Design a protein around this nucleic acid. Sequence first.
RNA 1: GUGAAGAGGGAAACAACCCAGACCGCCAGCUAAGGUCCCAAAGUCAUGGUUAAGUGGGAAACGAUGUGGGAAGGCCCAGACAGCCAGGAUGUUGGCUUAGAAGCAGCCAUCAUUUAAAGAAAGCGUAAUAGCUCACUGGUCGAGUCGGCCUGCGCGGAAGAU
RNA 2: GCCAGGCUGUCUCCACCCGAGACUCAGUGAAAUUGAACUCGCUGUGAAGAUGCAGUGUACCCGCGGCAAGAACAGCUGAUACCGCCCAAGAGUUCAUAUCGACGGCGGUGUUUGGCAAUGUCGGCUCAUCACAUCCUGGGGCUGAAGUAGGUCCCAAGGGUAUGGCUGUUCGCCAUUUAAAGUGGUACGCGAGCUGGGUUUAGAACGUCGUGAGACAGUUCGGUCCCUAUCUGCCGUGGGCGCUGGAGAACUGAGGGGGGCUGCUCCUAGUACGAGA
RNA 3: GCUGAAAGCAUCUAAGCACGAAACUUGCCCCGAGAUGAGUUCUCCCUGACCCUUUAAGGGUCCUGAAGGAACGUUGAAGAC
Lengths: 122, 175, 176, 38
Amino acid sequence: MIQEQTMLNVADNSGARRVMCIKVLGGSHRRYAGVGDIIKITIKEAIPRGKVKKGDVLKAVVVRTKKGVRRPDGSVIRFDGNACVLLNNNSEQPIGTRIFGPVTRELRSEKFMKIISLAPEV
Amino acid sequence: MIGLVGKKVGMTRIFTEDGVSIPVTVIEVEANRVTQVKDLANDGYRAIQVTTGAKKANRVTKPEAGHFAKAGVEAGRGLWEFRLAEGEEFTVGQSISVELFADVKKVDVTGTSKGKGFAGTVKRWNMAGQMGNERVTVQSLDVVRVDAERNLLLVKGAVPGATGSDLIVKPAVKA
Amino acid sequence: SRVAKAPVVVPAGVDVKINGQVITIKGKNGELTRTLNDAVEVKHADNTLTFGPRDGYADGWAQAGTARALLNSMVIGVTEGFTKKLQLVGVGYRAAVKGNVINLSLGFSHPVDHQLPAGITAECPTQTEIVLKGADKQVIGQVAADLRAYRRPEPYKGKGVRYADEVVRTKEAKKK
Amino acid sequence: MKVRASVKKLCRNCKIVKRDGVIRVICSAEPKHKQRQG
RNA sequence: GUGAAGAGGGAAACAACCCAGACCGCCAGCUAAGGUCCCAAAGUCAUGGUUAAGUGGGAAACGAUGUGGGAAGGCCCAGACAGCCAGGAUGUUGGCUUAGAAGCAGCCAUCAUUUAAAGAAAGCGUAAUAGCUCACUGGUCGAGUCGGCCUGCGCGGAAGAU
RNA sequence: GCCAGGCUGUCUCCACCCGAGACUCAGUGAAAUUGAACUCGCUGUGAAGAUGCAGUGUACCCGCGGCAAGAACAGCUGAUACCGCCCAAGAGUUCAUAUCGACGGCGGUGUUUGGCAAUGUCGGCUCAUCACAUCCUGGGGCUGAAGUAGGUCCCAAGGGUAUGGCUGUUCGCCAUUUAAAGUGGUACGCGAGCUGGGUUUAGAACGUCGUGAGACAGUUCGGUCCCUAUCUGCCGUGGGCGCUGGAGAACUGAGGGGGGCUGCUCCUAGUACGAGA
RNA sequence: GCUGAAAGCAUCUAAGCACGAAACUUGCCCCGAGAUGAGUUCUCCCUGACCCUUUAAGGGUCCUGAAGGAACGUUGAAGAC
């Protein structure tokens, strides 16, 4: 579960360490966003040299949720924290070719066909 | 068409073959025999009075005892009415089982919500007053399993009323 | 006034009954009734239907002419079949007619069916162009109103050609 | 369309019709000349 | 003049609007303003006219085309208004800014034979062609018809208050 | 005096638990106020928002727990100013009104400037009511509509009609979403409902006026935000009575309560056909 | 909008005469016969006697106490009472 001004971790090799959420999209007058929802985040720390620079504002998607998600059989997926990966409006293919931690099975969306290959640990 | 009155027992989960957990609310549906028939000529409309349960002879008022005797059936715990849909009629003493709901796949549940004390304006409207103990209906519910030999009924979700509360299940008007 | 002062010849084979204001016309095509206005006291006048408005009505002459016109039309219809009638239909898209239903695909994703009001001499001489007939007399009330309401070969693109046998207009197309 | 207080025959092909107590102008050449309130 | 310092009735209520100056009592009669469908007492009263819109029952200046009527005016059984089964034929594919304007864009005349009759041209559409109508002219029915002024009211104007 | 970080229901949203009151039983018990009351809503008038005047509609009599809806600011006239309209030169490839529309006239407004001469006043929060004179869901007409999108007009109030930085701000500017982030009346709604951000009850502070107390639409600080809301109105629930001998149930129903929202994709379908786009 | 004249063309209408916007109302859910216009149906219970008067919607006396409710106890996922 993610709300306005929520701390999200980093699960890509883009060099980001801390990312802050500024706006929530995916529904008019919406107060919360899910794992399979788009959010607007910024960057707090950046590597010395790289493609990502301080002050950039861009889309992102949560891959792991502290609250977790439910399953039809009653099973629940819970993580130690919230992990988010930055996404761009154009060239949706994220720069990060490696993802830390496992992923769930809800990434079968039309736009998430290229991310299922990554994250070998499920 | 016509619904039946049952008793709420509890709710749990039912696992499908594919491995999906589905909530189910347990309703005991005793064979609700018909006591009286109302018609357009006499009563002004077509309806049937159904009864369920069983009351002790010492705990049944003599007028009710005579009314049940006229129908030639044992005295139940209450009477309920269901409007006919201009379809087949019924006869007094015709026991009705849960087999009717075995091929509907869509049911609506009416009942009284659990009583509660006074709820403030923020708690109620989000004027403050007592909540619960009023008729409320939740429609478009799908029956999961039907057990004719055990007088059991299971529907998805939750239904008004606590354990042991009487409720009414009717075929889903909306479709 | 001018229409009222015009006796209408009723040929053989047509029966006219004047039950007060009620006018009943029978003939080869079939029965026909039309409750006439109370402001006209038309005389039977066998072999004619001479119209004379009742005194005390300002609208008497116009009502008498209104009567005369369609009373003559009804007479020469019951003798031959709605002299003053047609229809227009074969509707320019994939379509068909059967029983009392004309199945159509007028520019929609679902079929649109117009109920035929219990009687029609449907035909399809050519594919799609304007025509029809008189035999249906009173059952032809509108009928084509539903056909045109769904679509009236939109007068820009002509996407689907007109009706039974004759023509309709259109002018230029951009989007399909 | 025009809802002005006064309606006049702008062109030859204008007809005055009193419908529902309203004097309208109907034109068979250009619909633009159609005005409602007379 | 009223109220101040005059009661009472009417205008639905109301002090400056109308009638009207209370000595007291009567279960008597007649009037003023205002009414005579009820509420609430009186004509669902007589005659002569307007009203088709609840305008009456709220509204000004300013502009037309409804009936009732007045002054009249034009064309009218040597037959009018609306009408059209009939005609609209020929160079005038024009010189002219030749890119085609040919009447349907303009410089331009705005002619001339058939003639019971037709213009070198008013609308619809074509790159212009072409084609369909109208000015007028043959034939039948046919009697009235057309444009403005005066107006009382119907109307616009006009949109009024939980 | 400043920065970075860890740190709690201050909030998205509040969820639940322990005590003291709130409610009942037994007894003690006073006040603010009080002309008398058999103390309803709406329209109209009124020294001008009427429980008491004319009209209209509803309501069986009496209790209980409740949210609190109950000179400075707010008379006569309308030059000024705003609003709508009529005519209409013209722009618009020809064509005034598809869209604008110059010069003119006509009315309405008290939404500016104006002329005469203890009713607590602008904001923000809670709570809302009503007209469309409609921002949207909109359909329907014209289009210069060879199309969604649209440019303009008739109707629609059934419903919806934002978040943050500058102001106390109404308003306005800015950035991001949405279908839009509407116009106005309700003492420019709502302080005996909530705070007072400046102004404008009582205190005091700075500059000015007067010897003086005092005063300043000259400017800050905070500011009893007074009135046992008796009573008016409403949600819920009771005691009495009548439905005509009495009683227990099941219901038809005159009327009444509130909601009729919506994004994305899918197959249809790269579909109608369209010179192609 | 099919035909369509009046007014040999034409026109939504004059006449034979139908569709249609999510706009409006029903339809969807709940309270509701104090709706004093006080509604409909089923069942149950009472089938005594005497006296007087101002002689009739009269009064009193002895017996009777029907069904049902209330009274009190256990109490409830019903409840401030």
